[PDB]
Enzyme design. Structure first.
Site, PDB file in Angstrom:
ATOM      1  CD  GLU A  26      -3.010  -1.036   2.307  1.00 18.94           C
ATOM      2  OE1 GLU A  26      -2.623  -0.968   3.492  1.00 18.94           O
ATOM      3  OE2 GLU A  26      -4.220  -1.039   1.998  1.00 18.94           O
ATOM      4  N   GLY A  93      -8.391 -14.745   0.101  1.00 21.98           N
ATOM      5  CA  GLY A  93      -8.868 -13.427   0.494  1.00 21.98           C
ATOM      6  C   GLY A  93     -10.330 -13.458   0.918  1.00 21.98           C
ATOM      7  CG  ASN A 120      -6.089  -2.421  -3.538  1.00 25.38           C
ATOM      8  OD1 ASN A 120      -6.060  -3.263  -4.449  1.00 25.38           O
ATOM      9  ND2 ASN A 120      -6.057  -2.751  -2.247  1.00 25.38           N
ATOM     10  CE1 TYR A 127     -11.961  -6.627   0.451  1.00 28.92           C
ATOM     11  CE2 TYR A 127     -11.636  -4.243   0.348  1.00 28.92           C
ATOM     12  CZ  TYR A 127     -11.183  -5.502   0.700  1.00 28.92           C
ATOM     13  OH  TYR A 127      -9.954  -5.633   1.298  1.00 28.92           O
TER      14      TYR A 127
HETATM   15  C1  ACO Z   1      -9.659  -3.148   4.088  1.00 28.39           C
HETATM   16  C2  ACO Z   1      -8.352  -3.512   3.158  1.00 28.39           C
HETATM   17  O1  ACO Z   1      -7.454  -3.823   4.077  1.00 28.39           O
HETATM   18  S1  ACO Z   1      -8.234  -3.493   1.634  1.00 28.39           S
HETATM   19  C3  ACO Z   1      -6.445  -4.051   1.352  1.00 28.39           C
HETATM   20  C4  ACO Z   1      -6.536  -5.310   0.464  1.00 28.39           C
HETATM   21  N1  ACO Z   1      -5.147  -5.766   0.247  1.00 28.39           N
HETATM   22  C5  ACO Z   1      -4.275  -5.623  -0.750  1.00 28.39           C
HETATM   23  O2  ACO Z   1      -4.605  -4.983  -1.783  1.00 28.39           O
HETATM   24  C6  ACO Z   1      -2.889  -6.236  -0.625  1.00 28.39           C
HETATM   25  C7  ACO Z   1      -2.496  -7.144  -1.843  1.00 28.39           C
HETATM   26  N2  ACO Z   1      -3.579  -8.067  -2.297  1.00 28.39           N
HETATM   27  C8  ACO Z   1      -4.148  -9.027  -1.486  1.00 28.39           C
HETATM   28  O3  ACO Z   1      -3.783  -9.172  -0.333  1.00 28.39           O
HETATM   29  C9  ACO Z   1      -5.274  -9.872  -2.120  1.00 28.39           C
HETATM   30  O4  ACO Z   1      -5.152  -9.767  -3.526  1.00 28.39           O
HETATM   31  C10 ACO Z   1      -6.724  -9.449  -1.643  1.00 28.39           C
HETATM   32  C11 ACO Z   1      -6.885  -9.575  -0.115  1.00 28.39           C
HETATM   33  C12 ACO Z   1      -7.045  -7.981  -2.074  1.00 28.39           C
HETATM   34  C13 ACO Z   1      -7.713 -10.335  -2.338  1.00 28.39           C
HETATM   35  O5  ACO Z   1      -7.473 -11.776  -1.987  1.00 28.39           O
HETATM   36  P1  ACO Z   1      -7.402 -12.817  -3.082  1.00 28.39           P
HETATM   37  O6  ACO Z   1      -7.186 -14.180  -2.497  1.00 28.39           O
HETATM   38  O7  ACO Z   1      -6.471 -12.380  -4.132  1.00 28.39           O
HETATM   39  O8  ACO Z   1      -8.824 -12.833  -3.757  1.00 28.39           O
HETATM   40  P2  ACO Z   1      -9.912 -14.079  -3.840  1.00 28.39           P
HETATM   41  O9  ACO Z   1      -9.339 -15.085  -4.703  1.00 28.39           O
HETATM   42  O10 ACO Z   1     -10.478 -14.556  -2.514  1.00 28.39           O
HETATM   43  O11 ACO Z   1     -10.923 -13.226  -4.672  1.00 28.39           O
HETATM   44  C14 ACO Z   1     -12.264 -12.839  -4.395  1.00 28.39           C
HETATM   45  C15 ACO Z   1     -12.605 -11.871  -5.542  1.00 28.39           C
HETATM   46  O12 ACO Z   1     -11.565 -10.806  -5.535  1.00 28.39           O
HETATM   47  C16 ACO Z   1     -10.832 -10.658  -6.757  1.00 28.39           C
HETATM   48  N3  ACO Z   1      -9.428 -10.216  -6.524  1.00 28.39           N
HETATM   49  C17 ACO Z   1      -9.020  -9.149  -5.747  1.00 28.39           C
HETATM   50  N4  ACO Z   1      -7.725  -8.953  -5.709  1.00 28.39           N
HETATM   51  C18 ACO Z   1      -7.199  -9.967  -6.508  1.00 28.39           C
HETATM   52  C19 ACO Z   1      -5.826 -10.296  -6.897  1.00 28.39           C
HETATM   53  N5  ACO Z   1      -4.787  -9.599  -6.447  1.00 28.39           N
HETATM   54  N6  ACO Z   1      -5.651 -11.355  -7.700  1.00 28.39           N
HETATM   55  C20 ACO Z   1      -6.686 -12.061  -8.160  1.00 28.39           C
HETATM   56  N7  ACO Z   1      -7.999 -11.836  -7.874  1.00 28.39           N
HETATM   57  C21 ACO Z   1      -8.222 -10.733  -7.033  1.00 28.39           C
HETATM   58  C22 ACO Z   1     -11.083 -12.011  -7.461  1.00 28.39           C
HETATM   59  O13 ACO Z   1     -10.926 -11.863  -8.899  1.00 28.39           O
HETATM   60  C23 ACO Z   1     -12.513 -12.405  -6.933  1.00 28.39           C
HETATM   61  O14 ACO Z   1     -13.483 -11.706  -7.718  1.00 28.39           O
HETATM   62  P3  ACO Z   1     -14.559 -12.356  -8.682  1.00 28.39           P
HETATM   63  O15 ACO Z   1     -15.350 -13.286  -7.853  1.00 28.39           O
HETATM   64  O16 ACO Z   1     -15.306 -11.251  -9.239  1.00 28.39           O
HETATM   65  O17 ACO Z   1     -13.690 -13.021  -9.714  1.00 28.39           O
END
Ligand code: ACO
Lengths: 156, 159
Positions: A26, A93, A120, A127
């Site tokens: 971030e 996630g 992001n 979400y």
């Molecule tokens: C309140 C906050 O703290 S917001 C901060 C969120 N964190 C970050 O951005 C840090 C880096 N990224 C991550 O940690 C992760 O990518 C997260 C937490 C954002 C998402 O977890 P993931 O395991 O990648 O996503 P998961 O597979 O459970 O996906 C659920 C949905 O999110 C999407 N998604 C979000 N981020 C990603 C990613 N980086 N890669 C792939 N899919 C993602 C998926 O495509 C899916 O959507 P859909 O059903 O429409 O296809």
């Protein structure tokens, strides 16, 4: 397989390393001693889950705390959200999000909040998929914050 | 008008909820009021309260509700969640006086981090808080207030 479980003092080393990951992600204080010193003690002001593959190792985390809303009552605020790069997009996630959902109800919290970074975009889209409302755009809420002297003056 | 700001006592929950309902009724959003008088008493006047409340009393005409958080950017922080003053008392500086006190609580606790959210229409409070040292977060950093409300919540929990 993956399991989203409540953290134990034993995971505080991994959690510290993941705090330094997410923030670096971030782009912009709490040593391990700090994590245990509050996250478990006896009067926790914050708790968490530690995505763990079943060799068994911590592969991401979700930390939250209980806040309050004047419309519904007991609310949950999901702060840090982060998964290890190699392990994203494979359902982890969301499992953390679903676990926070369970804790919410189990603790009498019908709703849950959190902040999100504008660039992001992927997370935001995540979400929204799971039912979240971007109240900033769907209502117009603008987070606001004071630091140091600003707060000192506000206080009069 | 002769008014004082003070910590709310469990007995103020009736007036606090009445005020919350008067507001929502004003915005034609009544149906969104799910909070209860018993919850206001329990959620903050038992073991470890979810919130703290300051009331403006002459007859309670306003309230301020806050609590502390635990993010990860700057540690502990006081957070203002809501402030309301009856229409008949607007322009008297009561809401302004209430916030100053929430800030004093933080400092009295040893916390200098104060957070809150502002409504998009407010064009004075924002530019004002900035002249104080604060900085809007959604217009700049891109921080967006996300909310998983009741329908989405239960669905996520499996229900
Ligand atoms: C309140 C906050 O703290 S917001 C901060 C969120 N964190 C970050 O951005 C840090 C880096 N990224 C991550 O940690 C992760 O990518 C997260 C937490 C954002 C998402 O977890 P993931 O395991 O990648 O996503 P998961 O597979 O459970 O996906 C659920 C949905 O999110 C999407 N998604 C979000 N981020 C990603 C990613 N980086 N890669 C792939 N899919 C993602 C998926 O495509 C899916 O959507 P859909 O059903 O429409 O296809």
């Amino acid at each position: 397989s993956v399991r989203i479980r409540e953290a134990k003092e034993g995971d505080c080393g991994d959690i510290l390393r993941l705090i330094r990951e997410l923030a670096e992600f971030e782009k912009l204080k709490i040593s391990e001693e700090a994590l245990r010193a509050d996250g478990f003690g006896d009067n926790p002001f914050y708790h968490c889950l530690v995505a763990e593959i079943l060799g068994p190792c911590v592969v991401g985390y979700g930390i939250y705390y209980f806040i309050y809303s004047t419309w519904k009552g007991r609310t949950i605020y999901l702060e840090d959200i982060y998964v290890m790069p190699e392990y994203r997009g494979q359902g982890i996630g969301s499992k953390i999000i679903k676990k926070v959902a369970e804790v919410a109800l189990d603790k009498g919290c019908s709703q849950f909040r959190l902040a999100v970074l504008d660039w992001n975009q992927r997370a935001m889209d995540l979400y929204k998929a799971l039912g979240a409302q971007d109240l900033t755009e769907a209502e117009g809420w603008h987070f606001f914050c004071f630091q140091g002297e600003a707060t000192r003056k506000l206080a009069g």
